[PDB]
Structures are given as structure tokens and as C-alpha cells.
Amino acid sequence: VQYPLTDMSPILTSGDDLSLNPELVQAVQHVVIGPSSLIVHFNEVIGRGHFGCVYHGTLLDNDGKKIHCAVKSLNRITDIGEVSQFLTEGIIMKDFSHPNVLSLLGICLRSEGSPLVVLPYMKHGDLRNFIRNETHNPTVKDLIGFGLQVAKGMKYLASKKFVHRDLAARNCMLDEKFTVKVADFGLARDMYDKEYYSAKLPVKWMALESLQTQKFTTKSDVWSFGVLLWELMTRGAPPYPDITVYLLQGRRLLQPEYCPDPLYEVMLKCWHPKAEMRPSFSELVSRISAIFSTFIGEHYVHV
Ligand SMILES: COc1cc2nccc(Oc3ccc(NC(=S)NC(=O)Cc4ccccc4)cc3)c2cc1OC
Ligand SMILES: [Cl-]
Numbered sequence: 475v476q477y478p479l480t481d482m483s484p485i486l487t488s489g490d491d492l493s494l495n496p497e498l499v500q501a502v503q504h505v506v507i508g509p510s511s512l513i514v515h516f517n518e519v520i521g522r523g524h525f526g527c528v529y530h531g532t533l534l535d536n537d538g539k540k541i542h543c544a545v546k547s548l549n550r551i552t553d554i555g556e557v558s559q560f561l562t563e564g565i566i567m568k569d570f571s572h573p574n575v576l577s578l579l580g581i582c583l584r585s586e587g588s589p590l591v592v593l594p595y596m597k598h599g600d601l602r603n604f605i606r607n608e609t610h611n612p613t614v615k616d617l618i619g620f621g622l623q624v625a626k627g628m629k630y631l632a633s634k635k636f637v638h639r640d641l642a643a644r645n646c647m648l649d650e651k652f653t654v655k656v657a658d659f660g661l662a663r664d665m666y667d668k669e670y671y672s673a674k675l676p677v678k679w680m681a682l683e684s685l686q687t688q689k690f691t692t693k694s695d696v697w698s699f700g701v702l703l704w705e706l707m708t709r710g711a712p713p714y715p716d717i718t719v720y721l722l723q724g725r726r727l728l729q730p731e732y733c734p735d736p737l738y739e740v741m742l743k744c745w746h747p748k749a750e751m752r753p754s755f756s757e758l759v760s761r762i763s764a765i766f767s768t769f770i771g772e773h774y775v776h777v
Contacts, residue, residue, distance in 0.1 A: 486554075488554040488557075491583070493554060494554070494557070494558060494561070495558060498558060498561055498562060498565065501565045501568060502561055502564075502565055502581050502583070502589075504568075505565070505568055505578060505580045505581055506580060506581060506582075506583065507533065507579070507580035507581060507582040507590075507592055508582070509582055509583070509584040509585070511533065511534050511582075512531055512532075512533055512543075512545070512582045512590065512592060513531060513532045513533075514529050514531045514545045514547075514582075514590060515529055515530045515531060515532070516529055518530040520544055521662065521664050522664075522665055523549075523659075523661070523662050523663045523664055523665050524549070524663075524665055524668075525548070525549055525550075525556070525661040525662070525663065526546060526547055526548050526549055526560065526588075526660075526661040526662040526663075527546070527547050527549065527662060528544050528545065528546050528547070528662050529544070529545045529547065530542070530543075530544070530545070530595075531543040531544065531545035531590075531592060533579060533592060541579070541594070542594075542595040543579055543592045543593060543594060543595050544592075544593045544594070544595050544596065545582075545590050545591070545592055545593075546563075546564070546590070546591040546592075546593065546661075546662045547588045547589075547590055547591075547662075548560045548588040548589070548661060549588075551587065551588050551589075556661070557589070559660070559661065560588075560589065560591070560660070560661050561581065561589055561591075563591070563658070563660040563661060564578055564581055564591035565578070565581070566636075569634070570630070570631070570634070570636075572626075572627060572630040572631075573626075573653060574623045574624065574626045574627030574630065574653070574654055574655060574656055575627045575630060575631060575655060575656050575657070576593065576594075576596075576647055576655040576656065576657035577593075577594060577655075578591065578592070578593065579592040579593060579594055580592050594649070596647035596648060596649050596655060597648075597649055597650040598647075598648035598649065598650070598652070599647065599648065600643070600644050600645070600646065600647060600648070600659075601620060601624075601643045601644075601646040601647070601648050601654060601706075602642070602643035602644045602646075602705060602710045603644075603710070604648050605617065605620075605643070605705075605706060605709045605710045606709060606710035606777065607777075608777045611774055612709070612774075612775055613769070613771040613772065613773050613774055613775065614707075614732055614734065614769055614773040614775060615766065615769035615770065615771045615773070616652075616771070617706045617707055617709070617732075617775055618706075618707075618734075618737065618762060618765060618766045618769065619766060620646075620648075620652075620654050620706055621702070621703050621706050621762055622759065622762045622763055622766050623653065623654035624641075624646055624654055624656055624699065624702060625699065625755055625758045625759045625762055626759055627646075627654065627655070627656030628641065628656060628695060628699060628755040628758075629754075629755035629756050629758070629759050631656065631755075632692045632695070632754070632755045632756075635692075637690050637691060637692055637694075637695060638656070638658065638690075638695045638698070639658075639690040639694075639695070640658055640676050640679070640698075641656070641679065641695050641698035641699055641702055642670075642676060642679050642698065642701070642702060642705070643702055643705040643706065643710060644659070644664070644667055644670070645657050645658045645659055646702075670712075673688065675688065676698075677717045677718075678701065678712075678713045678714055678717055679697075679698040679701045679702075679713070680694065680697065680698065680717075681693070681694035681696075681697035681698070681745075681749065682697075682718070682721055682722070682745075682747060683749055684697075685717065685718045685721075686718065691749065692755070693749035693750065693752050694749065695755075696744050696749075696752040696753060696754075696755065696758070697744055697745055697749075697752065699744055699755070699758065700740070700741040700742075700743075700744025700745050701713055701727065701741075703733075703737065703740070703741050703744070704727045704730065704733075704741060707730040707732050707733035707737070707775070708730045708732075708733075709775055709776070709777050710777075711730075713727055714727065726741075726742060726745050727741070727745075732773060732775045732776075734765065736761075736765050737762070737765055740753070740758070740761055740762065740765070744758075
């Protein structure tokens with residue numbers, strides 16, 4: 475409710491930066507973008523969600539060159555926990571340095587309104603929408619290639635002991651050189667993804683054990699990766715067109731028609747009932763790199 479008739483809920487106010495966590499603030503301060511150095515084009519919305527939004531922005535570097543960016547914004551800055559989670563969603567990238575992981579250009583704090591997390595524009599948007607878009611004509615090799623890229627990102631993130639928790643094609647970005655940036659929209663979650671979040675959790679991407687404990691690990695990320703592979707080879711079909719009960723009947727996602735057998739064997743390993751028996755992202759990189767190398771771009775996958 476944006477325009478309530480009356481306040482009913484008690485008002486917990488966070489002021490009249492200092493109210494935030496010191497370490498978070500320090501981290502945000504050293505990736506600061508000056509309010510005047512960023513132009514946000516609020517008329518040019520890239521994507522809307524119920525908690526946040528993403529706009530086209532332009533950033534001027536010190537040399538005067540215009541940089542095209544995406545500017546993520548919080549719809550409401552009255553809840554301190556939401557504001558903190560929002561800045562954390564941006565600042566976590568400051569400690570990642572990998573070509574298959576989304577980077578942070580900076581965070582613009584202005585005198586009024588939402589902080590603004592600035593990201594490099596990703597020409598082709600989210601991987602799911604890209605592969606679903608009929609206009610594109612990816613081959614099996616292209617599609618496996620994207621999976622390989624996601625695997626490399628996750629290998630790096632796993633090496634840094636980072637648990638993704640929401641690995642899915644919708645959360646991977648694709649830049650102009652068709653480089654896949656593992657990511658997470660977080661509070662800018664698109665309003666049309668709500669069906670995939672059932673806490674609101676992404677149940678169709680979640681490991682058997684996470685569905686029951688709601689605990690997430692790198693091994694549960696491996697499960698999600700398998701589903702992500704499935705998404706790729708079906709060119710973005712929704713998985714499993716209660717999921718715990720379904721799975722526990724003894725089922726897995728069916729092999730997609732354009733999914734090669736060795737790659738399905740890999741998805742099945744990613745869905746091993748026992749988490750500890752699931753492949754590492756390192757092994758997935760190895761395995762998928764091999765499978766990838768066998769193709770030559772002659773199998774075109776239909777939407
Ligand atoms: C061309 O279209 C788009 C183009 C778009 N280019 C750019 C950005 C976009 O949105 C994002 C995407 C992602 C984030 N991510 C943030 S703030 N944090 C994280 O992703 C943290 C993180 C990092 C690695 C692993 C897990 C978690 C913000 C905004 C874009 C969205 C677009 O359309 C929906
Ligand atoms: Cl191919």
C-alpha cells in the first residue's frame with residue numbers, strides 16, 4: 475500500500491548512513507559515484523519489480539567518455555533492513571573479479587531517495603530472455619558454451635566460498651560479446667518472475683535437501699546449475715510445467731531433445747540425491763568443456 479489511508483503499524487524510523495552497518499558503509503563509500511557524474515534516465519525503465527527497478531543510466535568517466543549502465547533502485551527507502559540488503563546486493567560484487575561474474579561500477583548516494591547501484595549495461599539482458607527470444611539462433615554448442623561460462627563463474631564463486639542461492643538463467647546476464655555474467659537481480663526481481671518464487675523461494679531450481687531445510691550450499695548451487703543447464707538446452711522452457719513430493723516420487727527433469735546424452739548424465743549428477751556426491755563446479759567446468767569441444771555449431775536449437 476503506497477498511499478495508506480492511515481498509519482496503523484508502529485513507526486520504526488532509522489533517523490531524522492550512520493544508522494547503517496559501519497562495514498557496509500565503508501565498503502559502499504570506497505565505490506562511491508558522485509551524484510553529478512551519473513545521469514539516471516527514469517523515463518527509460520529497463521525493468522520493473524515490486525521492490526525495486528532498473529533504469530538506463532549514463533556514467534561519465536574522468537576522460538569524459540559516456541558509459542552505458544544499468545541503474546538499480548529501491549522502490550521504498552523506509553525499511554532499514556531492505557536498504558541494507560539492497561546495498562549488500564551491490565557491494566558483494568566489489569570482491570569478485572571474474573569475466574563470468576557481474577561487476578559493480580559503483581553506488582551513487584544522493585541527498586534524497588534510493589541509493590543507486592550502477593552496473594555495466596548488459597546488451598542482451600538476462601540469459602533466459604535471450605535464449606527464449608526466437609530472433610536468436612543458438613546452436614547446441616552456443617548453448618553448452620553458455621552453460622560452460624556459468625560453470626566457470628560458479629567455480630570462481632565457489633572458490634570464494636560464496637553460495638549463490640538463486641542460480642537460474644533469469645539471473646545470468648549476457649553482454650555484447652555474448653559473455654555470461656553470473657548474477658542475481660535480488661530486490662530488482664522482475665515482476666513476471668513471481669510465479670517462480672513460491673519465504674519466497676525458487677523451488678523448481680532448489681535441491682531436494684534445501685526444499686526441506688531451506689538451507690543452501692555450494693552443493694545446492696550445483697543442483698540449480700543442473701536445472702540451469704536444462705533451461706539452456708530447452709531454450710528457456712519453464713522447469714516442471716509440492717515439488718518436493720514430485721521429486722520424491724523418483725523423478726527428474728526429462729532430457730531435452732537437443733541435450734546430448736553426456737550432458738544429461740551431467741545434469742543427473744547435479745541432481746544426485748546425496749549432495750556430497752554431486753560434482754564440484756571445477757569438475758563441471760572440466761566435463762562440460764570436454765562435451766562442448768565435441769560440437770561444431772551445426773545443431774540449431776528451436777524455441
Ligand atoms: C538489456 O536489459 C537489461 C540489462 C541489464 N544490464 C545490467 C544490469 C541489469 O539488471 C541488474 C542485474 C543484476 C544486478 N545485480 C546486483 S545489484 N547484484 C548482484 O547481482 C550480486 C551478485 C553477483 C554475483 C552473483 C550473485 C549475486 C543488478 C541489476 C540489466 C537488466 C536488464 O533487463 C531486465
Ligand atoms: Cl552444435
